[PDB]
Amino acid sequence: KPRQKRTATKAYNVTQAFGRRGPEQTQGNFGDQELIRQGTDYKHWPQIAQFAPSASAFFGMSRIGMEVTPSGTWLTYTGAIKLDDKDPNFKDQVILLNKHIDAYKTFP
Protein backbone atom coordinates (compact mmCIF):
# COMPACT_ATOMS: atom_id res chain seq x y z
CA LYS A 1 0.00 0.00 0.00
CA PRO A 2 1.18 3.56 -0.68
CA ARG A 3 2.68 4.91 2.52
CA GLN A 4 0.11 7.71 2.85
CA LYS A 5 -2.76 5.18 2.83
CA ARG A 6 -1.34 2.79 5.43
CA THR A 7 -3.14 2.14 8.72
CA ALA A 8 -0.96 1.20 11.68
CA THR A 9 -2.29 -1.46 14.07
CA LYS A 10 -0.84 -3.91 16.57
CA ALA A 11 -0.24 -6.29 13.65
CA TYR A 12 1.44 -3.61 11.49
CA ASN A 13 2.76 -1.02 13.90
CA VAL A 14 3.86 2.60 13.46
CA THR A 15 7.50 1.64 12.97
CA GLN A 16 6.64 -1.00 10.39
CA ALA A 17 4.30 1.31 8.48
CA PHE A 18 6.00 4.69 8.86
CA GLY A 19 9.55 4.13 10.10
CA ARG A 20 11.26 4.85 13.39
CA ARG A 21 10.55 8.17 15.07
CA GLY A 22 13.42 10.62 14.93
CA PRO A 23 14.65 14.19 14.53
CA GLU A 24 15.28 14.36 10.79
CA GLN A 25 12.91 16.33 8.59
CA THR A 26 12.13 13.15 6.62
CA GLN A 27 11.13 11.22 9.78
CA GLY A 28 7.96 11.33 11.81
CA ASN A 29 8.33 12.57 15.39
CA PHE A 30 4.93 11.63 16.86
CA GLY A 31 4.12 8.83 19.27
CA ASP A 32 5.17 7.35 22.60
CA GLN A 33 6.01 3.66 22.85
CA GLU A 34 2.39 2.59 23.43
CA LEU A 35 1.06 4.45 20.37
CA ILE A 36 3.94 3.17 18.23
CA ARG A 37 3.19 -0.42 19.25
CA GLN A 38 -0.59 -0.20 18.77
CA GLY A 39 -1.27 2.37 16.05
CA THR A 40 -5.02 2.83 15.58
CA ASP A 41 -5.59 0.20 18.31
CA TYR A 42 -4.20 2.72 20.84
CA LYS A 43 -6.66 3.52 23.62
CA HIS A 44 -6.59 7.27 22.86
CA TRP A 45 -6.43 6.99 19.08
CA PRO A 46 -9.88 8.66 18.62
CA GLN A 47 -8.67 11.70 20.57
CA ILE A 48 -5.64 11.96 18.25
CA ALA A 49 -7.53 11.23 15.03
CA GLN A 50 -9.98 14.09 15.68
CA PHE A 51 -7.15 16.38 14.55
CA ALA A 52 -6.27 14.51 11.34
CA PRO A 53 -7.60 16.17 8.18
CA SER A 54 -10.13 14.79 5.75
CA ALA A 55 -8.81 14.49 2.21
CA SER A 56 -10.71 17.67 1.29
CA ALA A 57 -9.25 19.55 4.26
CA PHE A 58 -5.74 18.22 3.65
CA PHE A 59 -5.79 19.78 0.19
CA GLY A 60 -7.88 22.77 1.33
CA MET A 61 -5.93 23.91 4.38
CA SER A 62 -2.35 22.96 3.57
CA ARG A 63 0.35 24.68 1.62
CA ILE A 64 1.09 22.10 -1.09
CA GLY A 65 4.21 21.87 -3.20
CA MET A 66 6.14 19.51 -5.45
CA GLU A 67 9.85 18.81 -5.05
CA VAL A 68 12.13 16.63 -7.18
CA THR A 69 14.99 15.14 -5.16
CA PRO A 70 17.40 12.29 -5.90
CA SER A 71 15.00 9.82 -4.25
CA GLY A 72 11.97 10.86 -6.33
CA THR A 73 9.15 13.36 -6.78
CA TRP A 74 7.44 14.42 -3.57
CA LEU A 75 4.23 16.20 -2.72
CA THR A 76 5.09 18.47 0.22
CA TYR A 77 2.54 19.73 2.74
CA THR A 78 2.53 22.11 5.70
CA GLY A 79 -0.18 23.69 7.79
CA ALA A 80 -1.68 24.36 11.19
CA ILE A 81 -4.90 23.16 12.82
CA LYS A 82 -6.41 25.21 15.64
CA LEU A 83 -7.58 23.44 18.77
CA ASP A 84 -10.98 24.53 20.10
CA ASP A 85 -10.41 26.49 23.33
CA LYS A 86 -14.07 26.07 24.24
CA ASP A 87 -13.99 22.28 24.02
CA PRO A 88 -14.30 20.94 27.59
CA ASN A 89 -11.65 18.35 26.68
CA PHE A 90 -9.10 20.99 25.62
CA LYS A 91 -6.80 20.49 28.61
CA ASP A 92 -6.80 16.71 28.13
CA GLN A 93 -6.01 17.24 24.43
CA VAL A 94 -2.98 19.36 25.33
CA ILE A 95 -1.72 16.68 27.75
CA LEU A 96 -2.22 13.95 25.14
CA LEU A 97 -0.39 15.79 22.38
CA ASN A 98 2.46 16.68 24.77
CA LYS A 99 2.84 12.98 25.63
CA HIS A 100 3.43 12.02 21.99
CA ILE A 101 5.24 14.93 20.32
CA ASP A 102 8.97 14.04 20.36
CA ALA A 103 8.31 11.26 22.88
CA TYR A 104 11.04 9.19 21.18
CA LYS A 105 13.69 11.47 22.69
CA THR A 106 13.29 9.69 26.03
CA PHE A 107 12.98 6.10 24.82
CA PRO A 108 15.61 3.75 26.27
Place this chain on the structure above:
Amino acid sequence: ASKKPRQKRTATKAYNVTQAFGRRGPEQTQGNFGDQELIRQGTDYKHWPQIAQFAPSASAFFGMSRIGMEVTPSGTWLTYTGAIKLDDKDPNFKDQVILLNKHIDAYKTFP
Protein backbone atom coordinates in the same frame (compact mmCIF):
# COMPACT_ATOMS: atom_id res chain seq x y z
CA ALA B 1 -21.14 21.28 6.76
CA SER B 2 -19.82 24.42 8.44
CA LYS B 3 -20.50 23.02 11.92
CA LYS B 4 -17.63 20.55 11.67
CA PRO B 5 -14.13 21.45 12.88
CA ARG B 6 -12.18 22.89 9.97
CA GLN B 7 -9.97 19.80 9.55
CA LYS B 8 -13.03 17.52 9.17
CA ARG B 9 -14.89 19.61 6.60
CA THR B 10 -15.68 18.25 3.15
CA ALA B 11 -15.91 20.80 0.36
CA THR B 12 -18.59 20.31 -2.29
CA LYS B 13 -20.43 22.43 -4.84
CA ALA B 14 -22.83 23.52 -2.08
CA TYR B 15 -20.01 24.29 0.42
CA ASN B 16 -17.00 25.03 -1.74
CA VAL B 17 -13.28 25.22 -1.03
CA THR B 18 -13.39 28.95 -0.31
CA GLN B 19 -16.34 28.60 2.04
CA ALA B 20 -14.83 25.63 3.92
CA PHE B 21 -11.15 26.53 3.89
CA GLY B 22 -10.84 30.20 2.96
CA ARG B 23 -9.53 31.96 -0.10
CA ARG B 24 -6.40 30.52 -1.64
CA GLY B 25 -3.33 32.69 -1.30
CA PRO B 26 0.36 33.03 -0.45
CA GLU B 27 0.42 33.47 3.33
CA GLN B 28 2.15 31.01 5.61
CA THR B 29 -0.85 29.06 6.97
CA GLN B 30 -3.20 29.85 4.06
CA GLY B 31 -4.12 27.16 1.52
CA ASN B 32 -2.61 27.47 -1.93
CA PHE B 33 -4.15 24.47 -3.74
CA GLY B 34 -6.89 24.56 -6.34
CA ASP B 35 -7.73 26.06 -9.72
CA GLN B 36 -11.10 27.67 -10.29
CA GLU B 37 -12.85 24.41 -11.16
CA LEU B 38 -11.66 22.59 -8.04
CA ILE B 39 -12.36 25.60 -5.83
CA ARG B 40 -16.01 25.73 -6.91
CA GLN B 41 -16.53 21.93 -6.86
CA GLY B 42 -14.46 20.50 -4.00
CA THR B 43 -14.95 16.74 -3.77
CA ASP B 44 -17.52 16.95 -6.59
CA TYR B 45 -14.58 17.66 -8.94
CA LYS B 46 -14.58 14.89 -11.51
CA HIS B 47 -10.87 14.11 -11.03
CA TRP B 48 -11.05 14.32 -7.24
CA PRO B 49 -10.11 10.61 -6.83
CA GLN B 50 -6.79 11.25 -8.59
CA ILE B 51 -6.03 14.01 -6.09
CA ALA B 52 -7.38 12.22 -3.02
CA GLN B 53 -5.09 9.21 -3.64
CA PHE B 54 -2.31 11.40 -2.21
CA ALA B 55 -4.15 12.54 0.93
CA PRO B 56 -3.03 10.71 4.10
CA SER B 57 -5.05 8.44 6.31
CA ALA B 58 -5.28 9.63 9.91
CA SER B 59 -2.69 7.00 10.88
CA ALA B 60 -0.31 8.17 8.14
CA PHE B 61 -0.88 11.84 8.95
CA PHE B 62 0.35 11.26 12.49
CA GLY B 63 2.87 8.61 11.41
CA MET B 64 4.66 10.45 8.61
CA SER B 65 4.44 14.08 9.62
CA ARG B 66 6.46 16.35 11.82
CA ILE B 67 3.92 17.40 14.44
CA GLY B 68 4.22 20.33 16.81
CA MET B 69 2.08 22.51 19.02
CA GLU B 70 2.19 26.31 19.09
CA VAL B 71 0.47 28.64 21.55
CA THR B 72 -0.20 32.15 20.22
CA PRO B 73 -2.66 35.02 20.87
CA SER B 74 -5.13 33.32 18.52
CA GLY B 75 -5.05 29.99 20.34
CA THR B 76 -3.31 26.65 20.44
CA TRP B 77 -2.36 25.21 17.06
CA LEU B 78 -1.22 21.77 15.96
CA THR B 79 1.42 22.26 13.29
CA TYR B 80 2.27 19.68 10.64
CA THR B 81 4.75 19.25 7.82
CA GLY B 82 5.65 16.31 5.64
CA ALA B 83 6.12 14.90 2.18
CA ILE B 84 4.51 12.07 0.21
CA LYS B 85 6.47 10.29 -2.51
CA LEU B 86 4.86 9.80 -5.90
CA ASP B 87 5.39 6.36 -7.45
CA ASP B 88 7.50 7.02 -10.53
CA LYS B 89 6.90 3.42 -11.69
CA ASP B 90 3.16 4.05 -12.00
CA PRO B 91 2.32 4.39 -15.72
CA ASN B 92 0.08 7.27 -14.63
CA PHE B 93 2.92 9.14 -12.88
CA LYS B 94 3.26 11.85 -15.53
CA ASP B 95 -0.47 12.62 -15.41
CA GLN B 96 -0.37 12.72 -11.60
CA VAL B 97 2.38 15.35 -11.68
CA ILE B 98 0.45 17.37 -14.26
CA LEU B 99 -2.75 17.25 -12.19
CA LEU B 100 -1.07 18.33 -8.96
CA ASN B 101 0.85 21.16 -10.61
CA LYS B 102 -2.37 22.38 -12.26
CA HIS B 103 -3.73 23.19 -8.81
CA ILE B 104 -0.60 24.30 -6.90
CA ASP B 105 -0.62 28.12 -6.76
CA ALA B 106 -3.28 28.28 -9.52
CA TYR B 107 -4.92 31.19 -7.68
CA LYS B 108 -2.10 33.48 -8.87
CA THR B 109 -3.67 33.57 -12.34
CA PHE B 110 -7.20 34.68 -11.40
CA PRO B 111 -8.83 37.16 -9.02
